[PDB]
Amino acid sequence: MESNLTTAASVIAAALAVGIGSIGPGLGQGQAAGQAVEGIARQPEAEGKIRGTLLLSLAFMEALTIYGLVVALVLLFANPFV
Amino acid sequence: MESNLTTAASVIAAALAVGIGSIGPGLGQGQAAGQAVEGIARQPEAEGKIRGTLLLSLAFMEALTIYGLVVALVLLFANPFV
Amino acid sequence: MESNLTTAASVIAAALAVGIGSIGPGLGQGQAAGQAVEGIARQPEAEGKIRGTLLLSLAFMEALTIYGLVVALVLLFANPFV
Amino acid sequence: MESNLTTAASVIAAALAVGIGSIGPGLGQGQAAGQAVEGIARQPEAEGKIRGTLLLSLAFMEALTIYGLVVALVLLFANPFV
Amino acid sequence: MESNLTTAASVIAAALAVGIGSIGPGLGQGQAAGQAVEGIARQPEAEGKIRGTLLLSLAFMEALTIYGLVVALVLLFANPFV
Amino acid sequence: MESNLTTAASVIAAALAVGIGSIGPGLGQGQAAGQAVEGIARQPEAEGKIRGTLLLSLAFMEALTIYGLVVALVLLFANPFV
Amino acid sequence: MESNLTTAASVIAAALAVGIGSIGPGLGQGQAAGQAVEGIARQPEAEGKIRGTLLLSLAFMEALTIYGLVVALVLLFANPFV
Amino acid sequence: MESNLTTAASVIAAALAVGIGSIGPGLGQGQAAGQAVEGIARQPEAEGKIRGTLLLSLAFMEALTIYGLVVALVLLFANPFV
Amino acid sequence: MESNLTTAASVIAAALAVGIGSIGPGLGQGQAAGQAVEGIARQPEAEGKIRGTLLLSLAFMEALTIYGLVVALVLLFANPFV
Amino acid sequence: MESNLTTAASVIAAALAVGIGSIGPGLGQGQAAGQAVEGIARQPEAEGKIRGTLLLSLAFMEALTIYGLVVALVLLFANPFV
Amino acid sequence: MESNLTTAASVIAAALAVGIGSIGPGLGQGQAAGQAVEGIARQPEAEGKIRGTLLLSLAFMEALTIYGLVVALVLLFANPFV
Amino acid sequence: MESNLTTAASVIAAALAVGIGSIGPGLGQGQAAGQAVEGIARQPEAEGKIRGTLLLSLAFMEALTIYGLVVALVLLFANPFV
Amino acid sequence: MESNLTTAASVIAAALAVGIGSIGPGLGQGQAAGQAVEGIARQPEAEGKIRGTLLLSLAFMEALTIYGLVVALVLLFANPFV
Amino acid sequence: MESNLTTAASVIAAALAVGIGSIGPGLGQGQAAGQAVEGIARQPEAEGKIRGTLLLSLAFMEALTIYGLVVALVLLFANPFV
Amino acid sequence: MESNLTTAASVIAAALAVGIGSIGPGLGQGQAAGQAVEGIARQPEAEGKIRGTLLLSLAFMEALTIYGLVVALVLLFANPFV
Ligand SMILES: OC[C@H]1O[C@H](O[C@H]2[C@H](O)[C@@H](O)[C@H](OCCCCC3CCCCC3)O[C@@H]2CO)[C@H](O)[C@@H](O)[C@@H]1O
Ligand SMILES: OC[C@H]1O[C@H](O[C@H]2[C@H](O)[C@@H](O)[C@H](OCCCCC3CCCCC3)O[C@@H]2CO)[C@H](O)[C@@H](O)[C@@H]1O
Ligand SMILES: OC[C@H]1O[C@H](O[C@H]2[C@H](O)[C@@H](O)[C@H](OCCCCC3CCCCC3)O[C@@H]2CO)[C@H](O)[C@@H](O)[C@@H]1O
Ligand SMILES: OC[C@H]1O[C@H](O[C@H]2[C@H](O)[C@@H](O)[C@H](OCCCCC3CCCCC3)O[C@@H]2CO)[C@H](O)[C@@H](O)[C@@H]1O
Ligand SMILES: OC[C@H]1O[C@H](O[C@H]2[C@H](O)[C@@H](O)[C@H](OCCCCC3CCCCC3)O[C@@H]2CO)[C@H](O)[C@@H](O)[C@@H]1O
Ligand SMILES: OC[C@H]1O[C@H](O[C@H]2[C@H](O)[C@@H](O)[C@H](OCCCCC3CCCCC3)O[C@@H]2CO)[C@H](O)[C@@H](O)[C@@H]1O
Ligand SMILES: OC[C@H]1O[C@H](O[C@H]2[C@H](O)[C@@H](O)[C@H](OCCCCC3CCCCC3)O[C@@H]2CO)[C@H](O)[C@@H](O)[C@@H]1O
Ligand SMILES: OC[C@H]1O[C@H](O[C@H]2[C@H](O)[C@@H](O)[C@H](OCCCCC3CCCCC3)O[C@@H]2CO)[C@H](O)[C@@H](O)[C@@H]1O
Ligand SMILES: OC[C@H]1O[C@H](O[C@H]2[C@H](O)[C@@H](O)[C@H](OCCCCC3CCCCC3)O[C@@H]2CO)[C@H](O)[C@@H](O)[C@@H]1O
Ligand SMILES: OC[C@H]1O[C@H](O[C@H]2[C@H](O)[C@@H](O)[C@H](OCCCCC3CCCCC3)O[C@@H]2CO)[C@H](O)[C@@H](O)[C@@H]1O
Ligand SMILES: OC[C@H]1O[C@H](O[C@H]2[C@H](O)[C@@H](O)[C@H](OCCCCC3CCCCC3)O[C@@H]2CO)[C@H](O)[C@@H](O)[C@@H]1O
Ligand SMILES: OC[C@H]1O[C@H](O[C@H]2[C@H](O)[C@@H](O)[C@H](OCCCCC3CCCCC3)O[C@@H]2CO)[C@H](O)[C@@H](O)[C@@H]1O
Ligand SMILES: OC[C@H]1O[C@H](O[C@H]2[C@H](O)[C@@H](O)[C@H](OCCCCC3CCCCC3)O[C@@H]2CO)[C@H](O)[C@@H](O)[C@@H]1O
Ligand SMILES: OC[C@H]1O[C@H](O[C@H]2[C@H](O)[C@@H](O)[C@H](OCCCCC3CCCCC3)O[C@@H]2CO)[C@H](O)[C@@H](O)[C@@H]1O
Ligand SMILES: OC[C@H]1O[C@H](O[C@H]2[C@H](O)[C@@H](O)[C@H](OCCCCC3CCCCC3)O[C@@H]2CO)[C@H](O)[C@@H](O)[C@@H]1O
């Protein structure tokens, strides 16, 4: 439909946002979850407390990548320039 | 068949979204799963609890890359510009 | 629908702010959350204390990425130039 | 035959999607599998439980690279542009 | 209503300030907070003292990123050149 | 009997697919196999169970690189463009 | 308004000074703070001594990034050239 | 004796396939082999079992680089384009 | 107001001097301070001796970045060329 | 004798093949050999079994670089293009 | 006053000298100082000997960055070319 | 005296072959030799056995770089193109 | 006052020699000095022996950077070309 | 005198051969030597055996960098082209 | 009295030779020396033997950098081309 410098930059930008935005949170979620299951193996009676604190933490980390997602979707479906 | 800057940028962007988007979650899932199976060996009685928490964690990490896949699929099958 | 150097630079900027801005906080939140759940497994009675300090920590780290998000939203929705 | 910026970008993209897409899952699968076999050596009686959990994990990680494969295959066999 | 070298540089600059500016502090805050919750589990009676010292530390680290935010906001809302 | 942008890109692409595609799986397979032989030395009666789980794991990891090989072979023997 | 090579370089420089300038101090402050809270958990009676030493340390590290802030502020509000 | 972009790209491609394709497998084979000989020293009677699992592992890893070699040989001896 | 190659290089140089110049000293101060507060917890009676040696060390590290600041300030307020 | 893009690329390619191709195998051989001599010091009666398994492993790793060598020699002595 | 390739290179060079020149010495001073205060906590009667050896070591490391400083000051105040 | 693209590429290639080709083997030999001398200290009676296995290993690693040297010497003294 | 490619290259060269030339030695001196003070704390009576070996080591490492300084001084004060 | 692409490439190559060529052997020699002196402290009676094995090792590693020196010297004193 | 491609390359080359050439040996010398002083503290009667083996090792490592220095001095004082 339309191709210019800004449409080209928009699609690259969208991919960088979600692609790069998943690096930190992906690693961090693995580290937290790993400690969680180790803790459960160590003390199964704490499973409830452990899972609750993990779920909360997973949400904070997941939100970081969702910010990248939000930008991607704006660049694609509500682009202010093109 | 159309080739312009933006179609070219779109196909590259699609690949970077899923390619880069798999790095953190891939490493993270491995870390979490490794601790899970170590935990099951340590306390086989807790495997039900461990497996459920692991599954929850894997989902949160898988979703991060799936955001990448959504962007890629938008660029390829619902491209707003080209 | 305007395309120039600045609109293109703006979309790339928006993605870099939130993309790069999640790396450190994503990793850091994972480190903290991991220690939290390991602490809960060690001393389930300290769960309230651990959760409260974790939450406060997660907020400080989340805010770091949110500054990136704010910049991205300004560039997309309140751009001073284009 | 057809050769333009987009066909060239499409073949490079396809390689990057599966090439880069296998890095994190490759490492992660090794980490999880290594811990699985260490766990089986430690508690051979837990082999069934460990193998099931590992299998689930390997699938989650494999899927990440498969999203890359899908993008590659679309680019080579169902290209929307070129 | 304005596009030139310096408007383009300003938007990239704003993103780099807060994007890069969150890497060290993000990682550092995670390290400190992780030790804090581990400390609380170890010695719950010291929670108040630990929490107070952590809060101070988190503020010092958060400030480093805020300096980035300040540069970004000057560039966006009080730009000296454009 | 043919040289253009896309033939040149295709040959580089083929190399990157299998070249980069072997890094993660190569490292991961070494990690898993190392733990497997350490496990066998520790508990030789579990060799069969360890060997079976390792074999499955090696296949999952090998497949990641084979996806690269497949893209490379499509580019060389069934190229869609040139 | 003014736009030339030096204004563009000045805004980028300002971002780099505070952005890159926060990396080492950010990490270092986390390392020191983490050890401080671990020490307080170990010897709560030493909290006053530990907090004083930590505070002095945090100031030394904060100052490093502030030198970056100063350069940034000179560049934006007291630029010698442009 | 033909020289064009594609013959030049082909020779570089051939070298990158086998060059890069040995990195992960080279490292991985070392890791596995190291654990194998350490296992043999710990339990010399398990040598047959350790050797057999090592060999199978080495083959899986060697194959990863061989795919790179195959691509290089196709590019040198059965080039589809030039 | 003068803009040339050298004014542009000067402002960038100023930022790189203090920005890069803070990396090693920032990390180094954190390492030293971390060991100091650990030492005070271990032997509160030695805090006077520990604090003095730490202060001496922090100064030596702070001076390294201050050299960067001197160069930056020369480039901005006593520039020999522009 | 003859100089064109392809002769120039051929000589660079040759050097990259053997140069890069020695990185992984060089490190991996050191790791395996290191474990081997440690194992011999631990259990000198196992020297025969250890050395045999090491020799086999060294051969698999050495072959990875020889693949790079083969490509180099082809590019130099049996070049298909120039 | 004067702007040419060499004045521009001189100011960049000056900043690289002190900026890069502080990386190694900054980290090394932190490592040595960290060990020093740990040693003092361990054996406070050795404070004199420890501090003396540390001071000497700090001087050797500080001199490395001062070499960079010397070059910077020459490039700025005793430039042989411009 | 002839200077063209290919002579220039040849001299650079020669250096990259031996320069890069020494990295993995250099580090690998150090690792293996370090474990060897540690092993001799642990069991002086085994030094004959350790020295022989080390020598075998060093040779395999030295050969990897020698391949680099062969390529370099071919490029300098038996160049097929120039 | 001459400006050409070589004077500009010379000033950059001078800075790179001393800048880069301090990285390894800075880190190495820190490692050695750290072990020295830890050794003095362990055995204060060996202080003379430790100090003497440290000093000799520091000189060897300092000399490495001094070669960089010498090159920088030749380029600034005894330039063979410009 | 002579100046062309090949003389310029030759001087850069010579620097890269010995510069890059000393990285792996430099690190490796330190690793081996460190273990040698640790071993002598542990079993002083084994000093002769350890020193002989170390000497052999240092020679193997030194030779790697010497291959770089040889290429450099050929390029500067026996250049085949220029 | 001379400026061209090769004079410019020669000065950069001289800096890279000694700059890069000091990284590995600098790090390696620190590793070896650190172990030496730790060894002396552990076993002061072995100081002579440790010191002798360290001296030999430091010479081997120092020589690697001297090769760089030699290339640099040839380029500055006995340049074969310019
Ligand atoms: O809006 C841009 C207009 O400018 C064009 O010039 C060309 C220009 O010469 C060329 O350097 C430019 O390609 C170079 C731009 C780099 C691609 C960019 C890099 C990162 C961000 C995503 C992609 O493309 C323009 C085509 O969009 C054409 O003159 C015109 O058709 C086009 O519409
Ligand atoms: O035949 C010209 C066609 O291409 C134009 O874009 C030009 C553009 O101007 C030019 O700079 C560009 O060369 C620039 C190469 C940059 C490669 C780019 C890097 C990241 C993003 C993906 C790939 O080539 C395009 C050729 O397709 C127009 O976009 C298009 O309308 C037109 O159909
Ligand atoms: O600024 C307005 C002008 O935009 C275009 O300029 C563009 C041109 O299209 C583009 O290929 C070229 O891009 C060069 C690559 C830089 C792109 C930029 C880099 C940072 C991240 C955002 C993307 O540079 C020109 C900069 O002026 C065209 O010159 C013209 O169509 C239009 O008037
Ligand atoms: O006029 C439109 C032009 O479109 C293409 O030109 C292209 C040309 O192929 C390409 O090598 C050149 O640089 C293209 C950039 C390098 C290839 C690209 C890099 C990123 C990954 C995908 C592959 O730019 C030209 C456009 O600026 C056509 O191939 C060319 O024939 C034609 O002149
Ligand atoms: O001072 C602003 C000036 O910007 C343009 O000049 C520039 C223009 O940016 C672009 O085409 C080209 O540079 C564009 C590439 C640099 C993009 C930059 C990279 C890092 C910082 C963010 C984005 O060179 C032109 C040289 O004339 C216009 O040509 C000029 O009319 C306008 O006055
Ligand atoms: O579509 C293929 C076209 O390829 C050429 O265009 C290209 C050509 O590749 C080359 O000179 C130049 O780009 C060559 C540089 C890019 C090489 C590429 C980099 C990554 C992928 C592998 C190799 O730009 C030209 C722009 O016209 C020819 O000029 C054109 O006639 C031909 O049709
Ligand atoms: O004639 C003097 C020129 O001065 C500037 O041109 C500049 C132009 O702006 C710039 O994009 C282009 O490339 C400038 C390099 C990219 C921007 C720079 C990169 C490092 C960090 C600071 C930002 O070069 C032109 C000069 O060679 C003016 O902006 C331009 O209008 C004018 O043509
Ligand atoms: O493709 C055929 C043509 O080959 C040459 O093109 C070449 C040219 O020689 C070269 O300097 C230039 O190379 C540009 C650098 C890219 C080289 C390529 C990069 C990836 C790995 C392989 C090497 O690009 C042109 C691409 O078309 C010449 O244009 C011409 O003699 C010949 O007709
Ligand atoms: O309007 C032209 C003015 O700029 C000239 O320098 C030109 C220079 O020739 C040109 O290559 C340059 O574009 C080159 C862009 C390189 C950016 C550079 C990268 C590191 C150092 C800081 C930024 O732009 C300048 C524009 O200011 C002259 O230096 C000055 O006398 C004159 O006033
Ligand atoms: O076969 C290439 C033909 O093309 C030439 O153009 C020039 C071209 O302008 C220039 O960009 C090109 O240099 C740029 C190519 C980059 C060198 C390449 C990069 C990686 C792979 C190894 C080396 O060299 C060509 C010389 O071979 C000449 O026109 C002709 O003499 C030559 O034979
Ligand atoms: O002494 C340099 C003379 O050459 C100029 O050309 C321009 C040239 O076109 C342009 O590529 C060049 O900018 C490119 C040079 C890159 C900047 C350099 C990179 C690292 C070291 C520090 C900074 O700048 C020149 C301006 O100094 C002008 O023609 C003249 O005004 C100037 O005096
Ligand atoms: O005087 C021209 C001579 O050089 C030509 O090659 C040209 C070539 O076209 C040009 O792009 C090239 O500039 C390209 C610079 C690329 C540097 C290259 C990067 C990696 C490989 C080693 C160095 O310069 C050559 C100058 O020797 C021809 O190859 C040769 O026949 C001729 O004798
Ligand atoms: O060598 C003498 C000539 O110096 C200038 O050439 C310069 C030009 O100014 C510059 O923008 C351009 O620089 C290009 C960037 C490389 C700069 C160099 C890179 C390594 C570290 C030192 C800095 O290249 C030309 C190289 O000939 C001008 O051409 C001219 O004013 C003068 O006669
Ligand atoms: O016409 C043949 C040309 O051959 C040389 O030009 C050369 C020129 O020297 C060089 O700076 C330019 O870029 C050369 C690339 C940068 C230097 C090279 C980079 C890799 C490591 C070795 C050093 O390319 C020209 C050829 O394209 C001669 O020096 C020049 O006088 C002559 O114009
Ligand atoms: O052989 C030396 C020749 O050097 C120049 O050519 C060169 C000149 O270096 C420069 O402008 C340009 O290349 C300059 C960029 C390369 C700088 C180099 C990068 C790595 C090594 C250190 C510095 O290309 C010209 C091509 O003609 C002169 O133009 C020529 O008259 C002179 O004879």
CATH number for the domain spanning M68: value is 1.20.20.10
Please choose, from the candidates J66, J39, J67, the residue with its C-alpha nearest in 3D space to the C-alpha of residue J52. Answer: J39
Q: Give the minimum alpha-carbon distance from I48 to chain K in angstroms, rounded to a whole number.
A: 10
Please choose, from the candidates E47, E52, B41, the residue with its C-alpha nearest in 3D space to the C-alpha of residue C39. Answer: E47
Q: Is the CB of D5 under 6 A from ligand 2?
A: yes
Instruction: List the alpha helices (DSSP H) in chain H.
Output: 5-20, 23-42, 47-77
Contacts of K58 in chain I (CB under 8 A): 56-57, 60
Q: Is the CB of F5 under 6 A from ligand 6?
A: yes
- The rounded radius of gyration (Å) of the Cα atoms in chain A is 18
CB–CB of F34 and H29 under 8 A? Answer: no
Contacts of N32 in chain L (CB under 8 A): 29-30, 33-34, 37
| Lining residues, ligand 10, CB within 6 Å | H 3, 12; J 4-5, 8-9, 12; L 5, 9
Nearest to G3 among E5, E17, E57 (CB): E5
Contacts of O29 in chain N (CB under 8 A): 30
Dist CA L11 CA N80 (whole Å):
9
Please choose, from the candidates D32, J3, J36, O5, the residue with its C-alpha nearest in 3D space to the C-alpha of residue B32. Answer: D32
Dist CA M1 CA F41 (whole Å):
74
Angle of helix B47-77 versus helix B5-21 axis, rounded to 10: 170
Please choose, from the candidates M15, M20, M25, the residue with its C-alpha nearest in 3D space to the C-alpha of residue M75. Answer: M15
Nearest to D24 among B4, B24, B62 (CB): B24
| Lining residues, ligand 7, CB within 6 Å | E 5, 9; G 4-5, 8-9, 12
E36 in Cβ contact with C57 (< 8 Å): yes
CB–CB of F71 and D76 under 8 A? Answer: yes
Gap sites in chain H (C to N > 2.5 Å), preceding residue numbers: none
Dist CA N45 CA F58 (whole Å):
47
Nearest to J36 among H31, H37, H76 (CB): H37
Contacts of G46 in chain I (CB under 8 A): 40-41, 44, 47
The CB-side HSE value for G62 (13 A sphere, CA atoms) comes to 17
- Write the residue with the smallest CA distance to atom 13 of ligand 9: I5
CB–CB of A46 and C51 under 8 A? Answer: no
I18 in Cβ contact with I72 (< 8 Å): yes
Dist CA K51 CA K42 (whole Å):
14
Chain H interface mutation, best of J35, J38, J51, J66, highest count of H Cβ atoms under 10 Å: J35
Q: Which residue of D has its CA nearest to F28?
A: D30
Q: H/E/C letters for each residue in chain D?
A: CCCCHHHHHHHHHHHHHHHHHCHHHHHHHHHHHHHHHHHHHHCHHHHHHHHHHHHHHHHHHHHHHHHHHHHHHHHHHCCCCC
Chain N interface mutation, best of L4, L11, L79, highest count of N Cβ atoms under 10 Å: L11
Dist CA L69 CA N68 (whole Å):
8
Dist CA C76 CA D2 (whole Å):
37
Residue G77 CB contacts under 8 Å (≥ 6 apart), including other chains: E80
The CB-side HSE value for E12 (13 A sphere, CA atoms) comes to 21
Q: How far is the CA of H5 from the centre of ligand 6 (A)?
A: 7
Q: How far is the CA of L13 from the centre of ligand 8 (A)?
A: 19
Dist CA I21 CA I75 (whole Å):
15
Q: How far is the CA of A80 from the centre of ligand 1 (A)?
A: 19
Q: Give the minimum alpha-carbon distance from L76 to chain J in angstroms, rounded to a whole number.
A: 11
Indicate the Cα dihedral angle G50, G54, G57, G61, nearest 10°. 160
Nearest to A75 among C9, C11, C82 (CB): C11
- Write the residue with the smallest CA distance to atom 28 of ligand 4: D4
Degrees, nearest 5: CA angle H7-H8-H11? 85
Nearest to O10 among N11, N68, N69 (CB): N11
Three-state SS at M2:
coil
Q: H/E/C letters for each residue in L18-77?
A: HHHHCHHHHHHHHHHHHHHHHHHHHCHHHHHHHHHHHHHHHHHHHHHHHHHHHHHHHHHH
Dist CA M82 CA O10 (whole Å):
12
Chain J interface mutation, best of H5, H11, H50, H70, highest count of J Cβ atoms under 10 Å: H11
Can you say whether the dihedral through the CA atoms of C35, C41, C47, C51 is positive or negative? positive
The total of structural domains in chain E comes to 1
| Lining residues, ligand 14, CB within 6 Å | N 4-5, 8-9, 12; O 5, 9
Q: Give the minimum alpha-carbon distance from G29 to chain I in angstroms, rounded to a whole number.
A: 5
Q: Is the CB of C82 under 6 A from ligand 3?
A: no
CA K41, chain centre distance (Å): 27
Q: Give the minimum alpha-carbon distance from O48 to chain N in angstroms, rounded to a whole number.
A: 10
Q: Which residue of J has its CA nearest to L47?
A: J41
Give the position, in ligand 11's atom list, of the atom nearest the Cα of M12: 21
Residue H43 tokens, joined = 């339990």
Q: Give the minimum alpha-carbon distance from G50 to chain E in angstroms, rounded to a whole number.
A: 9
Ligand 13 pocket test target in M1, M2, M5 with most atoms within 8 Å of CB: M5
Q: Is the CB of L5 under 6 A from ligand 12?
A: yes
CB atoms within 10 A of CB K50: 29
G56 exposure class (CB count in 10 Å sphere: 0-12, 13-18, 19+): middle
- The rounded radius of gyration (Å) of the Cα atoms in chain E is 18
Q: Is the CB of G2 under 6 A from ligand 5?
A: no
CB–CB of M53 and O34 under 8 A? Answer: no
Taking one residue from D and the other from F, the number of pairs with CB-CB distance under 8 angstroms is 196
**Deposited resolution, Å:** 2.1
Q: Is the CB of H78 under 6 A from ligand 6?
A: no
Q: Give the minimum alpha-carbon distance from J53 to chain H in angstroms, rounded to a whole number.
A: 7
Contacts of K50 in chain I (CB under 8 A): 53
C34 in Cβ contact with A31 (< 8 Å): yes
Dist CA H31 CA J29 (whole Å):
9
Contacts of H7 in chain F (CB under 8 A): 3
DSSP for B27-81?
HHHHHHHHHHHHHHHH-GGGHHHHHHHHHHHHHHHHHHHHHHHHHHHHHHHS-S-
DSSP for O6-68?
HHHHHHHHHHHHHHHTTHHHHHHHHHHHHHHHHHHHH-GGGHHHHHHHHHHHHHHHHHHHHHH
Contacts of D36 in chain F (CB under 8 A): 53, 57
Degrees, nearest 5: CA angle H62-H64-H67? 110
The CB-side HSE value for N38 (13 A sphere, CA atoms) comes to 19
Angle of helix M5-20 versus helix O5-20 axis, rounded to 10: 0
Q: H/E/C letters for each residue in F22-36?
A: CHHHHHHHHHHHHHH
Dist CA J18 CA L35 (whole Å):
27
What are the percentages of helix, strand and coil residues in chain I, rounded to 5? 85, 0, 15
Give the position, in ligand 6's atom list, of the atom nearest the Cα of D4: 1
CB–CB of J29 and H30 under 8 A? Answer: yes
Task: Name the structure determination technique.
Answer: X-ray
Nearest to A57 among C3, C33, C69 (CB): C33
Q: Which residue of C has its CA nearest to A12?
A: C12
Dist CA G24 CA I65 (whole Å):
11
Q: By residue range, what is the domain housing residue I45? A: 2-79
Give the position, in ligand 5's atom list, of the atom nearest the Cα of E11: 22
Dist CA J33 CA L56 (whole Å):
9
Which one of the ligands is nearest to J1 CA?
12
CB atoms within 10 A of CB M2: 13
Q: How far is the CA of K5 from the centre of ligand 11 (A)?
A: 5
CB–CB of K62 and I65 under 8 A? Answer: no
